[PDB]
Amino acid sequence: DRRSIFDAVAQSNCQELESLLPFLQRSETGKTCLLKAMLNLHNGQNDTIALLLDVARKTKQFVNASYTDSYYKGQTALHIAIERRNMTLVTLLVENVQAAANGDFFKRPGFYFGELPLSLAACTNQLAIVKFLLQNSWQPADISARDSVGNTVLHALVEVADNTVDNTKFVTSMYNEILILGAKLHPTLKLEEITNRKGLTPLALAASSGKIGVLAYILQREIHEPECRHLSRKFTEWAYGPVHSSLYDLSCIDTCEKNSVLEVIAYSSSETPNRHDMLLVEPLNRLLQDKWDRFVKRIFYFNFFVYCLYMIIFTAAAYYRPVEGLPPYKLKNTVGDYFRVTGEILSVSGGVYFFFRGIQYFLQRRPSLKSLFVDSYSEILFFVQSLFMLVSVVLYFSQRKEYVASMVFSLAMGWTNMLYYTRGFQQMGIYAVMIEKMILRDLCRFMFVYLVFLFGFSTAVVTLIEDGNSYNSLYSTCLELFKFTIGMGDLEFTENYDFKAVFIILLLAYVILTYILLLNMLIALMGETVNKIAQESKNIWKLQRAITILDTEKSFLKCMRKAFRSGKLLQVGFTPDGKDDYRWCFRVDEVNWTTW
């Protein structure tokens, strides 16, 4: 009976097995009898698995037993042995490896490790098991296996990293060991370019998902072993004393097939855990600073100058808007009017430019709706200024004078938007970052609270007035009480009230609660937030400049796309495949006195 043998194996006794073996020979889940024996094993107390194997052999298609249910679909015995650290059991099963565990857990709570025994072992901090499996004799495990979505062993290794120092420790370690092992077994294959269905290199994924430690690893990797020197991503070009001159790979850091590591870091939607901190590695900092110094500083300054001219001409053509009658207007023969029409045309041209730029940005990036004001606070503003200018365009040919109520808005926005350009000047870029952050947090909170209070006490005071000028108004009373917050409040601004004591108690309560208590609270909270973000501001500014550089290079590929490339094409060492290692490497310097 199946139940009897299940209890026997759970009983850790072979009496039932021996008793039923002669009789059996004479004669949703589907868990295997050997699987049941292994499962109910303590200190290796399960020995019926070997007997089951011998009986099955004496009587291939069964050593490959697997689940049938969708909950544990495909759970593999070798996988279970790996979960148990089973050297004896796993070695027996393999001797007696590409199993696909495509179930729910392998795809609420669960564990993702890949779908292959080799991947599971690598995801369990067990190195002897992986050595044996990948180089097992009966059937060695192939390292280049790619699962359904394409996550290979390295892909899962990265996918399980969690940035914690020990986790970084052994993820980096085992990544290195598996890499060098695959290199020794296959000097011909290059594993890194292996990409999943999304087509992400392990570097690209370790950077996009946000795993920083593995990133610093992959960009700072070097090997001296003569046979596999050709896995290194760093080299030390020379050294006389404490001075060292070293290289870096830039394999596809700067420009890569579809998205390089930089292009992924910058345009990451900030759903990524930590992108601002991530440009602290050495090659990236050096690279971005080099690009800024060489050939994009001039472009950014020129862009800033052109925007200054556009604001100036827009301002001076808005200042002298015709006032005679209604729009549109006839062009008088004077010269000043010709100048003014030139100003209007340049103005609308700039407006349409910004409008399109905004649409193109919103098509390429496709930004979300719940985090649009925390990822891109500047593209919104430029596009909004463009929208107001274009609505003015629309209503200046609709014979209507209201266009100004739009255009004015635009113009104000215009000048304010100039702060966008203070990111090329670190010491002002950090200030503009603080403005952005405070406007998003502190004005919003304090303004909900302050409007609660203002409206409360303003209806309170209007329900009392009688008008027996026109203070019987919620708008004029809303003002007369708002002025108390700019130090222009008149405690006796009306005598059309029934009760003076009540009126004065109300205004005094209002001044104490908003002017004295709240507003000073806002000052205190601004102090707190500044003292906290003094550094997040620096990181965000560096990221702002990095994005500037990327957009700058992408847009002006037309003028000289490959002219200003990072680093130079250098020959660093020999590789067995072709005995030549040419790479777009980037040289940097360094020193150290402790090492000698």
Ligand X SMILES: CCCCCCCC/C=C\CCCCCCCC(=O)O[C@H](COC(=O)CCCCCCCCCCCCCCC)COP(=O)([O-])OCC[N+](C)(C)C
- Interface residue list for ligand 4DY (CB under 6 A): 377-378, 381, 409, 412-413, 416-417, 419-420, 432, 435-436, 439, 506, 509
Q: Which amino acid is at 279?
A: L
Whose CA is closest to 226, among 576, 467, 498?
576
Instruction: Report the nearest approach of ligand 4DY to the CB of residue 165 (Å).
Output: 35
Residue 106 contact partner, candidates ligand YFP, ligand X, ligand 4DY, none, CB within 5 to 8 A by sort of partner: none
* CA distance linking residue 72 with residue 220, whole number of Å: 40
Stretch that binds ligand 6OU, among 64-72, 324-332, 468-476, 513-521 (CB under 6 A): 468-476
Pick 354 or 541: Cβ nearer ligand X: 354
Q: List the one residue from 111, 319, 338, 574 that touches ligand 6OU (CB under 6 A).
A: 319
Helices 165-185/127-134 angle, 10° precision: 20
Q: Is 423 annotated as belonging to a binding site? A: yes
Q: Do 207 and 198 touch, CB atoms closer than 8 A?
A: no
Alpha helices in 365-488 (DSSP H): 372-375, 379-396, 403-417, 426-462, 474-482
Which tokens sit at 12?
């850790």
Helix (H) or strand (E) holding 536: helix 536-555
Asked if 305 touches ligand YFP (CB under 6 A), the answer is: yes
Applying CB under 6 A, which of residues 112, 292, 295, 307 lies at the interface with ligand X? Answer: 307
**How many positions of this chain bind its own copies (CB under 8 A)?**
69
Residue closer to ligand X, measured from CB, 22 or 468: 468
d(CA 116, CA 152): 9
Give yes or no for a cis peptide into 328 (omega within 30° of 0): yes
Instruction: Write out the two tokens for 418.
Output: 């100039």
Can you read off the two tokens belonging to residue 368? 């979300």
Taking the complex as a whole, how short is the minimal distance between the CB of residue 475 and ligand 6OU, in angstroms?
Answer: 4
452 binds ligand 6OU (CB under 6 A): yes
Instruction: For residue 428, state whether it binds ligand YFP (rule: CB under 6 A).
Output: yes
155 close to 119: Cβ distance less than 8 angstroms: no
Identity of the residue, 189 or 509, whose beta carbon is nearer to its own copies in the bound complex: 509
Q: 159, 205 in Cβ contact below 8 A?
A: yes
Residue 317 contacts ligand X per CB under 6 A: yes
Contact 343, 313 (CB under 8 A): yes
- Give how far the C-alpha of residue 201 lies from the chain's centroid of Cα atoms, to the nearest Å: 16
The reply to whether 445 sits near its own copies by the rule CB under 8 A is yes
* Complete DSSP assignment for 97-135: ------SSTT--------SSHHHHHHTTT-HHHHHHHHT
Q: Which does residue 431 bind out of its own copies, ligand 4DY, ligand 6OU, none, counting CB within 5 to 8 angstroms by kind?
A: its own copies
Work out which of 425, 499, 564, 582 binds ligand YFP, going by CB under 6 A. 425
Binding-site residues for resiniferatoxin: 377-378, 416, 423
Binding-site residues for Ca(2+): 490
Applying CB under 6 A, the residues found at the interface with ligand X are 303, 306-307, 310, 313, 316-317, 320, 336, 339-340, 342-343, 346, 349-350, 353-354, 357, 379, 382
Applying CB under 6 A, the residues found at the interface with ligand YFP are 301, 304-305, 308, 425-428
Binding-site residues: 3, 31, 36, 40, 72-75, 83-84, 377-378, 416, 423, 487, 490
Binding-site residues for Na(+): 487
